[PDB]
Write a protein that binds this ligand. Structure first.
Ligand SMILES: Nc1ncnc2c1ncn2[C@@H]1O[C@H](COP(=O)(O)OP(=O)(O)O)[C@@H](O)[C@H]1O
Lengths: 244, 51, 195, 242, 252, 195
């Protein structure tokens, strides 16, 4: 039983930390440690367990499906904007128009650490608003990849608070083992390169968090694995060309 | 002289417009990068000159 | 009230020490102050065992270790010298980058150009020496790590949105003919000892 | 430049799916579903009427491409094909339309539990839903774990490089005795696991995990504490004396 | 041939640079070409034809006469039947674009000549030649090493230290400490309330502890081993006090 | 033919810049040399906008930013000295250690030696304000990590075989101890309000 427990973290990178800052209902800086022999996230329904999974998936995927466990089958209610702003759609009772926890200028950071035989790899994301706007184009994003133990989400937040994106870029220039991407496509490409797995792997990892609404093998295959790759849009273009 | 960024943007838009075709091997993952790469392929091929 | 080094000179020296190198293309003002009073800057840096190396052609000043006669050599052992001596793979990448830099400098105009190269260009040249690790992702990761180390040495910049790096002019003074001759002699000795 | 290319692309996607399933069968071969049984997959093909009508229309188009009438018969055949395509597109979720224009809908799916030494099929669920809430859950969890292990494994390697996976309230229809088998299988595939459990199943995961992140809300402020099961037990003891 | 002329000038500049670099007596064929104020890039093929073309174009009178005649012809009704809108517009403005292209090509030539003159100064051709030769030798020699051994790849080389940065002095005054404010209050609250499970729900604790049938399995097995007799459910309950009532019984 | 600065003075200056301090206990030779020629070292550091603060009572030298007039510039910036603001927990630990060091100096006289403290003696102090992380092991881990961070800044040393750490003399000079006192008072007031 315990002999097998040592296999994890030897030939693979295992998650061993999550750090959040102004993410969902996690106001301030929160840190959670994850054991190398499997970990359980437990708590009364309506805390921040789905919030944590969504932070991790945001760090991992390109268009993560938020709250997939309960909203599977239909479109998700939550989005990145509502996590950054800390909206409280569900819990009401004194709801002041969705009770946006952080309506003004704000910064939210998320960070996940992975380890293998003492080698560390940290994924991070800083998402901030400079005004009261809530448009997707008004949120400034900076993704971070690191293999240096000294590059922690706390350090990134300190640098941001001190000197905005200018000092963030300057720190990246003089930092050893840090890579900052302003556009998530390049950051996901770097993740793909490091972990030698295509986008389908992380998309499937995302879909795995919504396995509750399962059915016969056919639905599990056509809805969980072997992602869509459908051709319902190409058919429309073909039809329009044939109309011409 | 067309600025490099504008040419890359135009090539990326054209590349996305024809992602379906199998001949072109256009990758939807990050068309912009591919466009840039393509342009560079023709800069060291001497079709165009960068300065 | 007392002898105070001119605030222009102090500011220029502090910037030079902070950044190691001072380029006219980025900070022409401080570069010009340093050039105007090279003796003053040399006197300021003397107690630190540091000296200023100038390249007026490239418009580039830099700080190098000042060895009096024979300080046991080991210039990398200077207390104020951070970083570590370049290793063989870093030296090979530096040679490749210097070859690219010389190629760019040959066909160079009269204004600032900031020699650039795509990361994908270095992949086959490196693969020739380090071998094929098995897939494109592995070699890309290896190249990115090497480039990060070199940037830590100040010879390059991190890849930009187009997957292109800039080879800094400091390389022309790291891999210059004298240093390249020394490295070639050392490599020949290593090869002879190996066999 | 169209229609024919679209159909060829759909067929190629079907082929890719089939090969992916075939090479995931080998990754599932290395782990015993039951104690010495092991599980395999079978693709098979859909026999919908829409696909056969499409085949008829494609044959007509191929025959018409050889007619010398200035592309009139060819145009008519292409018109029939495009009419079929538009019919499918407008009703984008009828089973026929999905089978026509969805690569992962032209072929069925089936699992088969076999014997490690005796290669004979011992139980082949050829679709054949016939299963309890716990049985379907077991099969789905096992197949999803196998797929995750295969996907996260770098090409030419049997050990995933990104070894961490996240499950969210995975097990709800299965008994506590069969969920442990799922956890054992997940560990066997080399995947480190982070489970998200409701207030239930806190005793089920206590036998397969060494630590818990307790997430508790104190109003509008969620907090998290990472504690070993023993420290959680000490906290409970403090509660019982408070 | 407007682009061909620029291509020829570029090739001529490259050839001149290569000749300067590869020549062993730089001093002669540098001053012989620098003190001179000629083209220094006289591409004998097309490029001298462009000079005559410029001479003809710069001639006045004929240019405006031809432009006026071209517009007169464009005005003719049959012109619309002959050409189309784009071709008509291009033909009408032919002279303007011709002069614009001539100016662009002349600017390119002047720029290239200035660039070659600047390269001829700074006397870096000899250094470029020596550096290229040394780099070629080093890259050819490095093929004899074993690059699959971390011991070889991590060998330290004798390259010098250039660009030594003296930054990050401790300077104990550099340290500042957190000042009381809302952020400090929130941090203190988070530190205190993390791992504060008192307010957590009661049902959470109740579900935390439950019948671990694993231990009960072995306990019951040991009880039967001790008795080694056919035992009923009531007797088992008496001997083993169930803490969960039917939860145990189902297991039994 | 030059005017090279004394070898020992250059070594002392480089050591001081590299470490930012000079303790008679650790480097008696360099400390004595700097004491012998304070004018030379202050002149050397003048161009860099730095100075040495003597402290013969504790046998400690340190680098202090000798900036310009900088009228009431509470946000003074130095190119070579990067300013850091410590955490809430780090600041609390620093304040506790500073007050303990002051108490040790009072009870042993100014300029005492090896103001030590015990990890078990610090755990309750941290638990009073920061609260209970949830276990003895977690408390020890938190305290050890904070002590490691402080040692990185050069304020304390690693625990010895007796689980004791020595507060280094550099705590005596911390720019603005008034902020530390205010933070401690605020924390104690908050705790009293809670109870
Ligand atoms: N992005 C968000 N949008 C809406 N509500 C949120 C968000 N983040 C946190 N919350 C609030 O915090 C709680 C989230 O509960 P959580 O434990 O994440 O869900 P679950 O019980 O499904 O795992 C709810 O009360 C919800 O109102």
């Amino acid at each position: 039983m315990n002999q097998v427990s040592g296999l994890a973290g030897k030939e693979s990178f295992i998650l061993t930390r999550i750090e959040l800052f102004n993410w969902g209902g996690f106001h301030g800086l929160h840190q959670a440690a994850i054991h190398q022999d499997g970990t359980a996230v437990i708590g009364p329904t309506g805390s921040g367990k789905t919030t944590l999974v969504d932070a991790l998936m945001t760090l991992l995927c390109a268009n993560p499906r938020y709250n997939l466990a309960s909203t599977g089958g239909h479109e998700s209610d939550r989005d990145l904007i509502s996590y950054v702003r800390g909206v409280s759609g569900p819990g009401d009772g004194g709801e002041g128009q969705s009770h946006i926890a952080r309506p003004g200028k704000t910064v939210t950071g998320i960070a996940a650490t992975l380890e293998r035989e003492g080698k560390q790899v940290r994924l991070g994301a800083l998402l901030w608003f400079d005004s009261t706007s809530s448009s997707v184009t008004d949120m400034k994003r900076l993704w971070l990849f690191s293999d240096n133990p000294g590059q922690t989400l706390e350090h990134w937040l300190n640098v941001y608070h001190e000197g905005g994106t200018r000092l963030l870029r300057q720190m990246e220039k003089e930092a050893i083992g840090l890579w900052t991407y302003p556009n998530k496509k390049q950051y996901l490409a770097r993740l793909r390169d490091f972990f030698e797995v295509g986008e389908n792997a992380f998309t499937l990892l995302n879909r795995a968090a919504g396995l509750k609404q399962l059915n016969s093998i056919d639905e599990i295959f056509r809805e969980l694995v072997l992602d869509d790759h459908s051709a319902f849009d190409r058919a429309a273009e073909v039809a329009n060309s044939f109309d011409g | 002289g067309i600025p490099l960024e504008e040419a890359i943007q135009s090539l990326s838009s054209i590349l996305i417009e024809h992602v379906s075709q199998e001949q072109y091997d256009i990758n939807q993952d990050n068309p912009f990068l591919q466009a840039s790469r393509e342009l560079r392929e023709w800069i060291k091929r001497r079709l165009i000159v960068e300065r | 009230s007392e002898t105070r080094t001119l605030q222009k000179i102090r500011e220029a020296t502090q910037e030079l020490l902070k950044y190691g190198l001072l380029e006219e293309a980025s900070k022409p003002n401080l570069y010009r102050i340093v050039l105007s009073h090279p003796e003053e800057v040399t006197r300021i840096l003397e107690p630190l065992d540091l000296d200023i190396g100038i390249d007026e052609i490239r418009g580039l000043l830099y700080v190098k270790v000042r060895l009096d006669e024979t300080p046991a050599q080991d210039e990398w052992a200077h207390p104020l010298v951070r970083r570590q001596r370049l290793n063989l793979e870093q030296s090979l990448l530096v040679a490749i980058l210097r070859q690219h830099f010389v190629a760019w400098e040959q066909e160079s105009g009269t204004g600032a150009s900031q020699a650039q190269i795509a990361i994908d260009d270095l992949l086959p040249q490196l693969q020739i020496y380090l071998g094929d690790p098995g897939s494109e992702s592995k070699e890309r990761t290896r190249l990115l790590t090497l480039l990060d180390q070199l940037k830590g040495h100040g010879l390059v910049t991190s890849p930009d949105a187009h997957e292109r790096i800039v080879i800094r002019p400091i390389i022309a003074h790291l891999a210059d003919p004298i240093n390249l001759q020394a490295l070639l002699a050392w490599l020949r000795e290593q090869i002879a000892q190996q066999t | 430049d169209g229609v024919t290319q679209l159909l060829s692309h759909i067929e190629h996607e079907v082929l890719v799916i089939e090969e992916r399933l075939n090479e995931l069968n080998e990754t599932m071969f290395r782990v015993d579903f039951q104690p010495d049984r092991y599980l395999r997959l079978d693709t098979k093909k859909v026999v919908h009427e829409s696909l056969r009508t499409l085949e008829k229309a494609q044959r007509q188009l191929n025959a018409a491409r050889f007619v010398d009438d200035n592309g009139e018969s060819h145009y008519k055949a292409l018109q029939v094909l495009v009419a079929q395509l538009r019919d499918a597109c407008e009703r984008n979720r009828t089973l026929g339309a999905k089978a026509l224009l969805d690569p992962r809908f032209r072929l069925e799916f089936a699992v088969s539990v076999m014997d490690r030494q005796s290669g004979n099929v011992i139980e082949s669920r050829t679709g054949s839903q016939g299963g309890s809430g716990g049985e379907k859950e077991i099969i789905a969890s096992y197949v999803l774990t196998a797929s995750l292990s295969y996907a996260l494994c770098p090409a030419g390697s049997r050990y995933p490089l990104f070894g961490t996976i996240i499950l969210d309230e995975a097990f709800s229809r299965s008994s506590h005795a069969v969920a442990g088998r799922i956890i054992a299988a997940l560990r066997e595939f080399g995947l480190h696991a982070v489970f998200i459990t409701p207030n239930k199943e806190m005793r089920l995961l206590r036998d397969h995990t060494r630590s818990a992140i307790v997430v508790h809300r104190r109003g509008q402020n969620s907090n998290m504490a990472s504690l070993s099961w023993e420290e959680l037990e000490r906290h409970y003891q403090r509660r019982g004396n408070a | 041939d407007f682009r061909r002329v620029e291509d020829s000038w570029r090739e001529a500049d490259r050839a001149l640079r290569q000749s300067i670099i590869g020549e062993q007596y730089h001093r002669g064929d540098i001053v012989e070409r620098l003190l001179n104020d000629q083209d220094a890039l006289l591409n004998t093929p097309e490029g001298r034809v462009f000079d005559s073309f410029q001479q003809q174009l710069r001639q006045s009178s004929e240019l405006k006469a031809m432009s006026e005649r071209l517009r007169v012809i464009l005005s003719h009704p049959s012109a619309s039947d002959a050409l189309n809108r784009l071709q008509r517009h291009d033909l009408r403005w032919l002279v303007k674009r011709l002069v614009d292209e001539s100016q662009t090509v002349l600017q390119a030539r002047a720029r290239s000549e200035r660039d070659v003159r600047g390269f001829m100064k700074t006397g870096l051709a000899a250094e470029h030649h020596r550096v290229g030769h040394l780099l070629n030798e080093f890259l050819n020699l490095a093929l004899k090493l074993d690059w699959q051994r971390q011991m070889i790849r991590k060998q330290e080389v004798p390259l010098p230290a250039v660009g030594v940065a003296v930054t990050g002095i401790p300077a104990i005054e550099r340290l500042r400490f957190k000042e009381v404010d809302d952020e400090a209050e929130q941090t203190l609250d988070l530190s205190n309330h993390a791992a504060d499970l008192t307010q957590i729900g009661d049902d959470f604790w109740d579900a935390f502890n439950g019948l671990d049938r694993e231990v009960l399995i072995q306990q019951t097995l040991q009880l039967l081993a001790k008795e080694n007799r056919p035992v009923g459910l009531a007797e088992l309950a008496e001997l083993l006090p169930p803490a969960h009532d039917l939860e145990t019984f189902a297991v039994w």
